[PDB]
Amino acid sequence: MQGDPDVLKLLNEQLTSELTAINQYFLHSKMQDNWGFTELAEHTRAESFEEMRHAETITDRILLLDGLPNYQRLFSLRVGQTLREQFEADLAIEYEVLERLKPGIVLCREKQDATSARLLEQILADEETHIDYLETQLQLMDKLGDALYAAQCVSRPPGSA
Amino acid sequence: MQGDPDVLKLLNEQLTSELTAINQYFLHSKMQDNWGFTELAEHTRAESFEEMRHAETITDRILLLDGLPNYQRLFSLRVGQTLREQFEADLAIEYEVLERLKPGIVLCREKQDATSARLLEQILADEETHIDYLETQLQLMDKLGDALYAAQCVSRPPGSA
Amino acid sequence: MQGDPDVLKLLNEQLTSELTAINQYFLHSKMQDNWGFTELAEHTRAESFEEMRHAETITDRILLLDGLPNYQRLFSLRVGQTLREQFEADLAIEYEVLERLKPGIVLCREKQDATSARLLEQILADEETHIDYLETQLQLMDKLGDALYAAQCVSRPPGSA
Amino acid sequence: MQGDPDVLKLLNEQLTSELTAINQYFLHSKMQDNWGFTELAEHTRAESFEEMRHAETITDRILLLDGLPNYQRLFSLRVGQTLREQFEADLAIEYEVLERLKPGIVLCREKQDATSARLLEQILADEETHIDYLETQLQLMDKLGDALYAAQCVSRPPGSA
Amino acid sequence: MQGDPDVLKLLNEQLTSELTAINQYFLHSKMQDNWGFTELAEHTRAESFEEMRHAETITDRILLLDGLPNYQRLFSLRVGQTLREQFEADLAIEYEVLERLKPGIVLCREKQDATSARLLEQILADEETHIDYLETQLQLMDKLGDALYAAQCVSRPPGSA
Amino acid sequence: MQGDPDVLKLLNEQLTSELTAINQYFLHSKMQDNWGFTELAEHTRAESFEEMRHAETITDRILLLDGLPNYQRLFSLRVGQTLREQFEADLAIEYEVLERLKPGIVLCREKQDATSARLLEQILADEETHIDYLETQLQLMDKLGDALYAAQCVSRPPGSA
Amino acid sequence: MQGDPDVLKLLNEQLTSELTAINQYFLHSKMQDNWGFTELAEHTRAESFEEMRHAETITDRILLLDGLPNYQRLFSLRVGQTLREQFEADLAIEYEVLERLKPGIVLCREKQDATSARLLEQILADEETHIDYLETQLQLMDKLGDALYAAQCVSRPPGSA
């Protein structure tokens, strides 16, 4: 099938977001592991795999629509130097996803591509959950304190890479 | 620990190659799936996961050596538009790996970092096997003919993405 | 026990034939593997193991007869450069086995060494089976054509060594 | 087999380190247990057993090379009086192992004793990992604070020797 | 891939030595069986199979490097006529392997073929182990006496081929 | 049998001390439960049961020796109103057990009642263990701080009676 | 708890013996393995582990009594060059343990430390049993003769390190 050019442009920009999120989350999780925050690392790693799945889903749809998935381009990674900065870095990307997909979904349905819209509706709900998780962590750090919060991210006894 | 700066530059160069290989192979697998070569696509996808593992292994070592893993850089993807071109594209990056790692391993041992050298020795063996597979497929296409080779890459009956 | 000196000379000639057949078949199977004909390679390797078993059985009898097994001597290997040449090379040694064992068996039963004769009767029937297999493959290549026959010797998707 | 005299001297020096690390680690873990840090004690004990295993592996190779394993000599134990001191003491012998084995490995490979080299490459990798665990715990204590870190090393309810 | 011409020459000489050791060990084991040393025979036969596996591993590497495995040449068998002579025979060829592979591994690494070096490092370790076993048996025969040693090589009651 | 009058006096004083420790420990555990220190409560309750078993063992021996177990007398309970006070309370009575049983065991043996001595030796060992636990907890509260220590005595989320 | 200073000195002296017996026994078992006496080596290794267990038990008690376990000091190893010499060497340290612990036990009971006494009574019983095993083997060698005894310490077929 031939996809609509604007829908393909949109799926491709979202693809770039996902490939960027894969790297950002993956690296965060590895850095978290290396700092001793092994319990938190497991969770960030899983976020990474969800992004891998998003990238795949989008690639499929781009191919089905006879487009060219862009695996060449990445956005700028935000590599945080502390737990708080890492949550904010990943929060920043998730909110860029909303800014895009909120009008994006509406644009797909105007173009009468319900299937693309539904696919992006599913990704949006997944990213809204990530946002929810991240925002709650930053809120928890505020309530517990950085030290105390970080203590909930290590195993007993603390472990390593 | 502090890694030797030339060793880390080499580990990061290799990391970039792995990240590039992940994208190249994964896209190739998806494209093979969409063309109906679903049997071949399963194998190419597995090659992609092996690169993901290489990236991870290298990332760990760079961190242990207190370096900064570069997840920002990719090399240029070669996206082939036929099966032969895809094998040739993937073969071209595996050969780049050899050119890098062959003197690389010797440099690591000279710098007295035998652990990073063994890590790269293991990746090198893995990539030599990928080379062997790819060169054998290009040979087989010559022996069988493109059509008949391709016919061994579809299921019974042929399927789709 | 003292074996008859002509029977021991015969048993040793055949052992040399088996030791040669072990190498020829084994190397053919490894070659086939490296060409991508992995399915065919499994069958040639098994013919190798059959020859290994013949060599052992003969070895045993030579020893029981207080002879010296010759493990030093090999005949000339025919190392084929194509599937057809490999079948022909392997067929050529099986035919040499026939020329030897057909009068050989009669000779053993003349020397009143029935047990060695039965030993060789068993080997002869196994080699007649290999001849049958080989002759049928050469016929099949003529019926199917080289490429099409070879395509039945790869897996789906084609693999390698 | 007669081993190279310099290889043997190196293997024996490393043996002495292992025997020392056994006692230091074992005693550390026992002290940790008596302080109530029973969860951390299990990890420290395990490090002990890893050292016992290195001692054994080296002993075997010294014997295979007709040398005399030195079970008489120990280095100076550093017995720390605090968790931080203990990590620092154990870190200090692991760094001594690096300074020995990094040129040690190159020396074995020069003497053309690749088997001894490989054995020490494996010990090196193991000790690099202890170093990584140790430096991560010292960093964690700085991020969490001594009291909070310590509370991750007791069970719920806190236990004892 | 095209292997280095000098490394292929080495791998091929190693292969001749393995093909020779298969024959030597195998025949020794059969001879041991016919003398009644059936328990010892089991162990010698296994050594034979280990040599078969080395021959295989080397063949695969020669083929991956586009070389021609030499299945035609054998070295001179040393066929011992007593247990002591057999251990000496077999020890003789294990030592020739060392003479060859100690500088060989160094040469592979200089040629920047780490993978072939690693393959030979593995074989070297395996042969060092054979040497250790063989040297131990010859020393045990000295300690126990030939009769008494031999008595530990038969079953209860002694069996036969 | 008729026990020695002096050993019976000792066994009976020991019995009073056990009956007292049952009550003290049991009440402490219940109090700990009502404060929310439910994980700590489990351990204190078990200490109570151990004291019940000591009381039983002593009763049986007094009866076998035709004595009159004194189930009427208690010593003064020390009921602490904080965790620290409770450990101190319980430690106080374990130390009184030592004061009594150290010369007691010596006295049984002088009276030639080895069996009663052995029985008390077993109790002494059990109490030394209680002392070790208690002393460790008081030292841990010093290291961690009262709040932090107490936090290791609650479940997640904190529970109640 | 504060242990009696003389009890602590005795426990530490015995600790030194154990640490020495660990090394002597372990090395003996490794040497026995390299000589081909692999069946006897398994028994000698086990004695080693028993010594490790004594070392641990003593360490625990020294710690419970707020002493400093001495992991720095070793006595002189007697490394025997023959099976008979090894039994004699190991017998010589077990007899040193008797000479220490026989008055040691009486001294603990005088200091009214019955728990330490019991712990050393248990070690004494264990070492009395090693002494019995050791003196029985020396007697057996005299009854069977060295060669014949030795042949009961190898497997069938004789093995190696």
Ligand code: HEM
């Ligand atoms: C092109 C971007 C990528 C795509 C589309 C992708 C896709 C996937 C998919 C579909 C899986 C299996 C998911 C599952 O069923 O659990 C996966 C697994 C994995 N990926 Fe990726 N990935 C990408 C990049 C990366 C990168 C950059 C890394 C690390 C540097 C990485 C590391 C891994 C690891 C460690 C696993 C699982 C390990 C295994 O079982 O092999 N991936 N990926």
Ligand code: HEM
């Ligand atoms: C050309 C050199 C040879 C190669 C590369 C070779 C390789 C092998 C391999 C890969 C196996 C499978 C089992 C294993 O290796 O663990 C095997 C089995 C065997 N080989 Fe060989 N071999 C060779 C020559 C010989 C010779 C000269 C004999 C003498 C009889 C022999 C006797 C056997 C026997 C009895 C078995 C097991 C029987 C069976 O599995 O059916 N081999 N060989």
Ligand code: HEM
């Ligand atoms: C002298 C050098 C030593 C060597 C070569 C040595 C070797 C070993 C080996 C090979 C094991 C079993 C391996 C395993 O289960 O993972 C072991 C276990 C043990 N070792 Fe050592 N060890 C040595 C010294 C010590 C010392 C000084 C202590 C101090 C008490 C010690 C305490 C233990 C304990 C508690 C175990 C495990 C107990 C068991 O499994 O029965 N070892 N040792």
Ligand SMILES: [Mg+2]
């Ligand atoms: Mg399509």
Ligand SMILES: [Mg+2]
């Ligand atoms: Mg670090």
Ligand SMILES: [Mg+2]
């Ligand atoms: Mg015979």
Ligand SMILES: [Mg+2]
């Ligand atoms: Mg030796």
Ligand SMILES: [Mg+2]
């Ligand atoms: Mg090839």
Ligand SMILES: [Mg+2]
């Ligand atoms: Mg009564």
Ligand SMILES: [Mg+2]
């Ligand atoms: Mg204490």
Ligand SMILES: [Zn+2]
């Ligand atoms: Zn996503």
Ligand SMILES: [Zn+2]
């Ligand atoms: Zn997301």
Ligand SMILES: [Zn+2]
């Ligand atoms: Zn790779």
Ligand SMILES: [Zn+2]
């Ligand atoms: Zn690759």
Ligand SMILES: [Zn+2]
């Ligand atoms: Zn045959």
Ligand SMILES: [Zn+2]
């Ligand atoms: Zn045949």
